[PDB]
Amino acid sequence: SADAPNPNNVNVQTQYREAPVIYRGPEPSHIDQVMMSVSDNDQALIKVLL
Amino acid sequence: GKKSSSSTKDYLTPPHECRLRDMTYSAPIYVDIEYTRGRNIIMHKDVEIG
Amino acid sequence: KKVRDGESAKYFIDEENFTMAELCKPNFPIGQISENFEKSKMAKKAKLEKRRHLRELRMRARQEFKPLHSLTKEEQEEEEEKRKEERDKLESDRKAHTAIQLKGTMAIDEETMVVDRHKNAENEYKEKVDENPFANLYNYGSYGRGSYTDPWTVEEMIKFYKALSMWGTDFNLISQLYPYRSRKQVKAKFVNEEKKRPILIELALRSKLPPNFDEYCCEIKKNIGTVADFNEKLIELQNEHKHHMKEIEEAKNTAKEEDQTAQRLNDANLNKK
Amino acid sequence: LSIDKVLKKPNRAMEYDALLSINVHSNNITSGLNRAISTGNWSLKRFKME
Amino acid sequence: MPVCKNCHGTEFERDLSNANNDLVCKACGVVSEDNPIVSSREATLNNARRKLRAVSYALHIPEYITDAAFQWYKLALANNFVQGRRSQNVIASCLYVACRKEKTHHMLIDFSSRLQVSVYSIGATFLKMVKKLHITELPLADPSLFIQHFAEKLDLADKKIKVVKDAVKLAQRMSKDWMFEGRRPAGIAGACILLACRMNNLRRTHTEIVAVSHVAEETLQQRLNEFKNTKAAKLSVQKFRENDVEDGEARPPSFVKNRKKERKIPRNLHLLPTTDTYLSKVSDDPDNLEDVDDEELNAHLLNEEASKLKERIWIGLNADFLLEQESKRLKQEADIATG
Amino acid sequence: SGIVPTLQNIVATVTLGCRLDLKTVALHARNAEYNPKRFAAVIMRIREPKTTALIFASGKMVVTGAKSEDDSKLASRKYARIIQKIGFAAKFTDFKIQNIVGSCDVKFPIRLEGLAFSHGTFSSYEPELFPGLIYRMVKPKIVLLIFVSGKIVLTGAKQREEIYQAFEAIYPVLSEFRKM
Amino acid sequence: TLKYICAECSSKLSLSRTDAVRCKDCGHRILLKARTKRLVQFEAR
Ligand SMILES: [Zn+2]
Ligand SMILES: [Zn+2]
After folding, report:
1. Same-domain status, F127 and F159
2. Where would one find coiled-coil regions in this protein (chain D)?
3. Is E28 labeled as ligand-binding?
């Protein structure tokens, strides 16, 4: 989906490779409030603070 | 943000909720204008603009 | 009675109301309402008065046997209402003309053209005439083309069978023979009458009546001259001959103007040296 | 400009497209009014400043 | 990528510690690399993108589906699908197919309201622009989010979940109960929102629902008449049952109109009837035409007497078009003389 | 079961040789529909069934109101006869069948939400443009009209065998999602 | 799974894999996440 092909019946969702964001930090921390929500354009906004 | 039949907005999206939803805190415009609709008819439709 | 929450979930709701049974789907006032009283009340009223307006238009169209001229008569009546509003709300016809002398004046009348700077200056006119209240109505579902018809007159059917016994499948003449109907709806009438009846239509095609009363009705109800093929053919030939003579005279005048321009160019070349 | 774009055909005069077509440039006051306050650069075409 | 010295083709892992993050191999340990280094037609498509932006921000759709409709229009123009339109119908049809891809709530009337175009011509061009697909897999048979998002601008309630969830439950139960197959999703949304509002202790004027839902007044009453016909509606007044069992005796009225179908006022290839024998019997002779003497060949034309009267009628009535045609020929043979 | 569709109407054309003229002979007759519109052609005795069709463009008039090929060519026998009653050549050349319309009903109509949810490769089912399903059969070139009411009506075919092979090959599909 | 605490009336709802995320009868849009049931350990320093 980085390019723009046609929406054919071929497998578009054929791979789900992992590119997350990771806590790069010197000291360990904790998670106290994680929330998933909606934005203006109906997409899953997720905010998490550490 | 008046809407002079009902209340002000009936939500008027709450501010601390609007800070977490990644939405702008807003209330719309309301105007009153004429037209030249018919050959002998002028409407007074009351619309909103942004 | 009024708008009040009588009851629900137990029986027919009756605390302050006029209901005595369930299944209130028919008219669908049941409990109470507190939203959109007057703007939703004055919508079916506007629809009903516009439907009665179109019905009285269809009734008036029977008298004057010209459909689009009846529509222009309707807009002539509403612009008579507009000039009545010009009498009411308010010389007044401050407009322009085909020439530049517009006003008051054509120019100054003292010594020379004084108001030519003001006469040379359309969008300043009389418009505060037609004032009408607003609404929030709609015309959706399907809007555009359509067919406003009625249950047809049986005397119109008798006239149609007499016509088809007298002057048959002649779509334009049948549309002109009923000069307040239209063309596609009487074509649907053609296929509808072709559907249900073989006997009187077969006797009608057996009859072969000569068309004199049809021309009588078409010359009275329309007031058309109907000049014959010799007179109309002679008028068309005279118009074609006048157009050909005008084209030949224009070509000869253009050739004479080109010759005069060539002579003027030769004279300018003689005067340049 | 939209009014002048519509009024250019032998069709019937503009009754309802004047009543409409205000919530098509209604996202010019909102988007500009949010962009100029979320960025901080106010381009004006009558005072000529940035 | 598989460039290494001691092993070949192994996996790799950039370091997390020591702020060093080099791309290193496994089980022997070799960096195997350096340090990491990190850091014409277009005018027509621009006009189409501006028009699609206008219809997108007017029809209240998100920003990604605008680019989806843009790449769909680019692929379609690469397939040369249409030319010379007013482009309102074209952009509306492209945004309609990109919008009916997703489960959002936009019908044909929301597009037909723009530019005051009749909805049937827009649907006709929508079935003319399917001369590129040969896939046509559109998930269109789910009017469930229509109930979820029509109930925000119409049928305003204090709760708007008690009416809405029971509304979509009754509407899906009725659609699975044989009352929806090409049966007006906006109309069934209006019908199973008026019914669920009747379940609530608040009433609506019948004009207020059918105004903004873009549905007729008589059709929703026909729907509610069929709701009164099918459901007994005695237990429906107080409270619906928690365990609703509905099996059999469920049909749209097209089944009824086929059940009565009037008004009183061993498969084999050779046993099928052949159609060439009807064409083979009657002759293919262009010269033989006189075998149809059944009082019709002797009754086509009449005499000269009652024919100049018909010519008089035709020249008297159909005169202005013939005069305009002859005058247009005179206009031509005037203005083609010069250059 | 083993039912057969009944045909409704067929439309074809025929090519003639010379330059025709139906402005004076039809003027000496009963009926003449002088059309100021695009199709400038007159029609005498439209109503008499399976005898007279309608408008010609350049002479190649269509066939209107015919079911069988006896009445289709018998009507075409009566058209070149009128054109020779004018006094012309009126050749009967290239009688090619273009449209045969057939309608039927299997009396047990079936569900279409599953036939449109799963069998979407050969159909474009759109609810309120038109309630009947548009079945795009590619073998042969026939666009079927599947209806919610169940009265299956076929059009666009050029042969009756094409209608039989199109209706027989869809009856197991009708018996697949078969709910009375 | 019993998680996804609301932010207006604090209801324990479990949304499916396709929800277009929405709350319960409170009529809200956002939702937090409940605490895990594991055993966190650390000293009191
Ligand atoms: Zn290694
Ligand atoms: Zn809550």
Report:
1. yes
2. none
3. yes
